[PDB]
Amino acid sequence: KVFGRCELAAAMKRHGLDNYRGYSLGNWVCAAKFESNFNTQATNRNTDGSTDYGILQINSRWWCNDGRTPGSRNLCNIPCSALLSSDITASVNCAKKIVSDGNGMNAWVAWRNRCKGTDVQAWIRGCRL
Ligand SMILES: [Cl-]
Numbered sequence: 001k002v003f004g005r006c007e008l009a010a011a012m013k014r015h016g017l018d019n020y021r022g023y024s025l026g027n028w029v030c031a032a033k034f035e036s037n038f039n040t041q042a043t044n045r046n047t048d049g050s051t052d053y054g055i056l057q058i059n060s061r062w063w064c065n066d067g068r069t070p071g072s073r074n075l076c077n078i079p080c081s082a083l084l085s086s087d088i089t090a091s092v093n094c095a096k097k098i099v100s101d102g103n104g105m106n107a108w109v110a111w112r113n114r115c116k117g118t119d120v121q122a123w124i125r126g127c128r129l
């Protein structure tokens, strides 16, 4: 599924991401835009052989099991394929664990490089939430 921008904003809000750990909704939409272009089926292979999955590009090195990242952890206790569903619940629940691990949203490179310090509000403007 390729979400529309307001459609994704509303789904994230329903799932408790608005102001989660002090990050307003537009941060999460911005991060999703640049990580996956709002596509739940996005995958990308990293240099270390890990892979990033789903709309928030969550890494198999630490967060999910894909059976092909030797020595990896599965901190979200999920198969990585679950991160690719049209239902974003599993991605949101796992992202909540990531952003709480001390490093906030800096875990997402695209957020750090393309969202942090910008007017993220603009990612939710015009949306009925
Ligand atoms: Cl915002």
Ligand SMILES: [Cl-]
Binding pocket: 109, 110, 113, 114
């Ligand atoms: Cl980047």
Ligand code: NA
Binding pocket: 060, 061, 062, 063, 064, 065, 066, 069, 072, 073, 074
């Ligand atoms: Na893993």
